[PDB]
Symmetry: C2
Amino acid sequence: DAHKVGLIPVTLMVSGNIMGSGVFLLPANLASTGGIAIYGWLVTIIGALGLSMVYAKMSFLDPSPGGSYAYARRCFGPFLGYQTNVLYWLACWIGNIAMVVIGVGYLSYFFPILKDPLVLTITCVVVLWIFVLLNIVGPKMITRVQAVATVLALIPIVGIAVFGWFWFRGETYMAAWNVSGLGTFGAIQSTLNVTLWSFIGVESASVAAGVVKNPKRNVPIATIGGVLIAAVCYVLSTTAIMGMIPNTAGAIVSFCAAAGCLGSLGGWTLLAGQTAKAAADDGLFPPIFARVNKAGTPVAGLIIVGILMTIFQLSSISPNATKEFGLVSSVSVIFTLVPYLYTCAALLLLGHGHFGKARPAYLAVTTIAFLYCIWAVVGSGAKEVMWSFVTLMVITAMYALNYNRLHKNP
Amino acid sequence: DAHKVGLIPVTLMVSGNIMGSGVFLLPANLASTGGIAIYGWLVTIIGALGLSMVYAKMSFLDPSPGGSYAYARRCFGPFLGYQTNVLYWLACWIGNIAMVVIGVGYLSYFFPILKDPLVLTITCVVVLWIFVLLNIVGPKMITRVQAVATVLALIPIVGIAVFGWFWFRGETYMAAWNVSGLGTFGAIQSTLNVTLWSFIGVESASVAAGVVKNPKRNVPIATIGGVLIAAVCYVLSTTAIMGMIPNTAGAIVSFCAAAGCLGSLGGWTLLAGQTAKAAADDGLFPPIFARVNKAGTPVAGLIIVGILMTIFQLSSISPNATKEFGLVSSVSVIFTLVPYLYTCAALLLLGHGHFGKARPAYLAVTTIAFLYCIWAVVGSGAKEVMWSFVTLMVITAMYALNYNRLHKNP
């Protein structure tokens, strides 16, 4: 096949969701803190690198298609998989709604503008659909748009990773020194309280599967290249930091920012098409998506993410906590952990005895991964996690709707 | 067999844990509120009655032995069962530690007394073991002690359910009328915020199984009789309520109170022996308990609940939130829901097509039950639930320790 992508457009998507909506936001998240505190970054890159590897090498066995759900289909796979999915999908779709509200806001001024009344909402509801459609074109199409836009946003970031280096200068950061974060002990958790909840997505490559050239070769390479890119970009970017705290060409960045979300939203809906229209096969959803207007893509699927994505989009017009941490914008984030947690489970009970010897190694990196997945949750909105819980319980109750599976029965 | 109990000592245990540690605490939990507000009770008794039935008729199929775990062994049954268990057991044991600290405090005065320094803790650590041992004698023995003590505490409660009736008198409660709770809408949730988190245990009869005469006949009868008893006692007891709010024979009650916890702790450890030393068989824990010094009982088991129960007991000496809601005393309570939630799941995917026709009925009462289980969680300590979550995630991670199951593999 050839209308089904290739390494370089995929690793760009993997780097491109992770990158991503968060960078033009990170430093200030660590300025009201609590900044530098670079340790925070050392921990998190270790953790996420491990998570990237767990996936990297779980897809290297069975990819997938989902993924993060095939796997959960072998830490069960029914109930646990249908819930791993519902709860994932249910959090790629939800994510966008609060992703655009920001990416349009990177254009708040500069053409359009406007960008204030019912106009941001109605402009945003329009953009969502540009991408639903760019996928009905795709998928080889959306990843293509995607690769471009994210490279456009590499302009600035890796503009500083080398150009920014040649600039500042220098001991000013040393002036800002550490502190602001109250001592090593616990001041790391200012950075781990943000460096962490913005490194999500390492799944995407293990999530494509069907829509990548060779899964068994291209997919891992993708997750790893993507993450490594993401990590490095992260570090060399939030090291351009001298002391400030109060929150011509500069225009190219006020744009190359919404440019990261031009490619993003596409990638992310692409995954909400897959990590559902999948489970809509293997077993159940219910489905529906399907139905797959021939030659790939789920016309039905992404078009339902449209209707849906909208309906919220124009009620989070508007309040819901009028930006991130929306008590509903963040829950779609905690959600995505449960799939990470099960991916880790599977990357072991499917290495039954590993389809690969010399284990004392793997039995390690996945334990890191468990830690990442767990610690992320542990430092988090008390209300905002309790909700993630009530979700699961109702998602389960909602195998009233599915009253027909099996295993070990009367 | 005959050293393995019978209906009347079991339904007494079922009523006797549920009863139980909570009654001599309920009214004041609804006086700082928010009292009467009797609706709260109408809702909750419906909900719990349904939960009692879900169990009542899940054990009527497969009992069990656990139960609440055999069942979760068929909403999976591996991972989901080993977690349903860990999380249950891990919450019968924990529960006592904060159960005695109160039941000794019902003797705070009246012999011993003392009851203040390291004396309550060291007196409490002694009592725990009286019951560990009374079970190594049992189980036919502990349920026997149990039946007695809980009947001793019926003296007071159903002392008022009839004697109390002949007393007060009368329209005074009408004087206290409703209110204090701010309007029907949401004032019910003062009562449902306590009538609820004190009706736990309806499981116990489905939890015994092996240690009851006929499971298929005695067990349900037990859950239902127990709960009905518990419900009625509840209502006719917190209706002796005229107006008060500020918080010879009277002595018989200051004792017949710690008398409810003389029987309780025994019953409850009995279940932490079962709903583990079970799963220690069927599949994994790891086990260990076993080993079952012949003729029933798990000498090893309850003795480990002793060591364990202690170790906490003398660190919650002492603070931990120095009474209920201990942010660790309550989490052992939220825990117990996940087993309720899965019991409901199973009471369906094992009625695959029900081993019983005329379904529109059952498909109902279990939906109530889901609501009960879910709503209980939803109104709850934001921190205290987030913890229940992090538990599960680590319990799962902890099938690093169990890296050998199966279902649908490479």
